[PDB]
Curated annotation (Swiss-Prot), chain A:
Belongs to the universal ribosomal protein uS4 family. This is Small ribosomal subunit protein uS4. Residues 1-41 are annotated as: Disordered. One of its GO terms (molecular function) is rRNA binding. Residues 90-156 form the S4 RNA-binding domain. GO terms for cellular component: small ribosomal subunit. Coiled coil: none annotated.
Swiss-Prot record, chain B:
It comes from the Bacteria. Belongs to the bacterial ribosomal protein bS16 family. Coiled coil: none annotated. GO terms for molecular function: structural constituent of ribosome. GO terms for cellular component: cytoplasm; small ribosomal subunit. Signal peptide: none annotated. Keywords: Ribonucleoprotein, Ribosomal protein. This is Small ribosomal subunit protein bS16. GO terms for biological process: translation.
RNA sequence: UGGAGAGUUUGAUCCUGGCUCAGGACGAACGCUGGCGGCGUGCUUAACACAUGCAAGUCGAACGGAAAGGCCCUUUCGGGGGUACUCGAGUGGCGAACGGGUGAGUAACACGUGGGUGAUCUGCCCUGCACUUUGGGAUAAGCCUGGGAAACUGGGUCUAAUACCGAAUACACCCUGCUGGUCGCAUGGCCUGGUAGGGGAAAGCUUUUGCGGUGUGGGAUGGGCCCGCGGCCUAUCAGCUUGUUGGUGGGGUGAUGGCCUACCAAGGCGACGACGGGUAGCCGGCCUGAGAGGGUGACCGGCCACACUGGGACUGAGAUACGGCCCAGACUCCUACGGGAGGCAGCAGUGGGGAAUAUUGCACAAUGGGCGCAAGCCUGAUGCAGCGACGCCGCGUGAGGGAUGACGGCCUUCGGGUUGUAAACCUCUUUCAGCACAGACGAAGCGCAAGUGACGGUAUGUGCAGAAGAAGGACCGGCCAACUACGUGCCAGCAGCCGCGGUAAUACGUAGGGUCCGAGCGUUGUCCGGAAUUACUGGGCGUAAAGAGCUCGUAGGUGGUUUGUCGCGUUGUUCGUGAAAACUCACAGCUUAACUGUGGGCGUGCGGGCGAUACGGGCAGACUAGAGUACUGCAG
């Protein structure tokens, strides 16, 4: 499935802004509901859980998929935290968002799911698609003139494109040199808390 | 009679076969004396690998190929080598390799500039 | 690569110790809810009883034939003859022992692993060598006729063969006697050793890519038999055994062997648990775990056992002979009462049992199998489809903008706050569904015919329209994310534990709000973890549970200093094996994933050779510090 409810709720509950530039979170940075002002009891479990919720509500990944990702990242011979972060970053919708072609991760996911993109010459419509080295992500010719891609291709002054990505074509081609490392990820939260939570 | 059969593998839609040497009385997916190649008909050129020396040995002791295996043995030339009629000519149409991802990557980068 | 804790005994504390909880899994079931797809999976209970339809045939190039199509002669349209293209029934060959099902029995050489067979068989297949001579008697079918209700069956006549039978040849083979050499691991084996005697077979068909028969040498495959080791619970089961333990001569078998038998001897097994009782198919694997270990044997794969119950053989290269035979029994059916028929633990299906498990579907297109020279025929094996959120995986139910933040709800300190960027509105996009068009791969296949895909007009691709057709469940006192109001009052109820209900409950019921998950969410059942709570890793015994009342001593366990030797343990290396699948690493292919393939690792072990000798052990010694004796005193 997918989460379709209000986005500001999660930002307010988690105490950080996940969309990035939302005014409602700044207007009220406290949890929602009647009792959004009550002091909370401090518990390591609560902090670890909130870190995991931050991670999986920033990228829009449900719990089962997140658990699969954590198992995959732990199995790998790196270290668990950055492995998980790089697996999350390698998603196609996240790549589209960080490529400056989508204002928000939700619209990047919507564009990918509608098959507006095309990876390595073959149409791909899977937001969970993972992107490998030397991947060429292209917009199909029919939808190049649509307003979303229009306003994406004339506002290329927003959030900087990370190093591991590079837009090279005036038609907004995307090239992937290598999977991102922990230094270049530039994500909120703490991976160690998630690793601790999933070892409980 | 020991025979050179094709056992089935793969999932439901895509049958991928192994060229096995087995007794005629065993089931299709039973124990195999030897595995001497594989055959994937789902590909456009339908990849075929046959280990030539083992095939020669098993034909020499008198194994009987089935009809698909006989066709494959003719294609790879093992059957003709075993008999000797036209020679041992490789008619195998190998799959055409795909260019490397790095080649396409640098091609796109150069096309940008 | 890798171990997380919390609550509960007290007025309070520390410890010991049990109970409970947070995790994972499932062939699941139940409750509420429910859109789609991919890939899997589905009687765990009654090895209960089964309606119905299919699940093993094939060959006319073995044979006599001519019932049905074809063709040709003939006609009164009743038909009649020939043909052999062809083919019912029949003789004959091969197959039917495979494949498919089930887990009742079995605690056993059944299984796993490693050996042995100088103690053995092997149809079809491959490949050497030698042959394929000669004669005869029948009979099925057909025709005539009899009995019986039926099942079925008797007689007469007649006919063929690659059916059956006699003989010759074989001297490669089998048996016997003598005899040579050689290798051993003892019986023995080998040199197709030599030599004398006796003996053992065959089948033809077909003109077309032609198929066949017999003996014998060697391969290949498939077995049989024997053995080491390994994996349950029970002395509130201590004796068990008389073909039972061994020998000899016979018999029997493919083969060794009390396998059988006559005689002879009196052995054989057992606390290292015989003999009984209970339970159970075994394994690769699966789940859990940090690991060791624990639980398990669903799918898939191998072996075993069985086919209504219990015995028995026959045919055959091969028989637990599922869809063979004989007998006995129970049950069901037919009967003219004389007698007959049947076996779903094959595929669907029915009834019953149960908490619970599916269609009386399509196709031989692909793979495997049987017969055939072949075309071809058969194949409920198999490939697919149908049904079930049963499981895993993936996707959608919209995206951007949108405020001193509308209405309503709820709370209120009456100020306002929250639902809430949520909504309303303005744009955008259409994934998946819906409609239209086109439309596969799977088939370097099969076929000497012109064609051939069950799935399927599916997947898929391109257009069309519109946010349009698409969210629920549990929980919120602490463990353990998430609190207020009203209703009720020791009631009604909740509860995994602690414990909550006594008119102002964050614990009941309902509403707002919230949190966790999400086509699912919870409950129950079961196994592992947490549990170091059976403690090998990794616990203990003064007072918490736990030192026998104390000795002697049997089996067993364990053992001072030192020399030489063995290489049993130990250790190094190498060879064989440890099926595949599974697991892990890497790569590849499905739009990704699940899934699938490829190549390594793993397969922790066992068998053979070779190396080492510190330690343990054995063997052969030596020493006196342990142990014991002697002598002189001593206390009780």
């Amino acid at each position: 499935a997918r989460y379709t409810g209000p986005a500001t709720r999660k930002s307010r509950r988690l105490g950080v802004d996940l969309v990035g530039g939302d005014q409602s979170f700044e207007k009220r940075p406290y949890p929602p509901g009647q009792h959004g002002r009550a002091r909370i009891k401090e518990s390591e479990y609560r902090q670890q859980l909130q870190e995991k919720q931050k991670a999986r509500f920033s990228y829009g990944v449900m719990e089962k998929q997140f658990r699969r990702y954590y198992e995959e990242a732990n199995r790998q011979p790196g270290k668990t935290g950055d492995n998980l972060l790089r697996i999350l970053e390698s998603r196609l919708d996240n790549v589209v968002y960080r490529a400056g072609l989508a204002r928000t991760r939700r619209m990047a996911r919507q564009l990918v799911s509608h098959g507006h993109f095309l990876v390595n010459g073959v149409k791909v419509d899977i937001p969970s698609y993972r992107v490998s080295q030397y991947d060429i992500i292209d917009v199909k010719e029919k939808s190049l003139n649509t307003l979303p891609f229009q306003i994406a291709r004339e506002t290329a002054g927003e959030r900087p494109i990370p190093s591991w990505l590079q837009v090279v074509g005036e038609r907004q081609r995307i090239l992937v040199h290598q999977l991102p490392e922990r230094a270049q990820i530039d994500v909120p939260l703490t991976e160690q808390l998630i690793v601790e939570l999933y070892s409980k | 009679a020991v025979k050179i059969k094709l056992t089935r593998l793969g999932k439901i839609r895509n049958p991928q076969y192994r060229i096995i040497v087995a007794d005629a009385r065993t089931r299709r997916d039973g124990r195999a004396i030897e595995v001497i190649g594989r055959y994937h008909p789902k590909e456009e050129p339908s990849l075929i690998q046959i280990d030539s020396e083992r095939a020669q040995y098993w034909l020499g002791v008198g194994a009987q190929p089935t009809e698909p295996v006989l066709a494959l043995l003719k294609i790879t030339g093992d059957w003709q080598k075993f008999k000797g009629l036209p020679g041992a000519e490789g008619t195998l149409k190998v799959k055409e390799p795909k260019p490397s991802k790095l080649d396409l990557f640098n091609a796109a980068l150069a096309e940008a500039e």
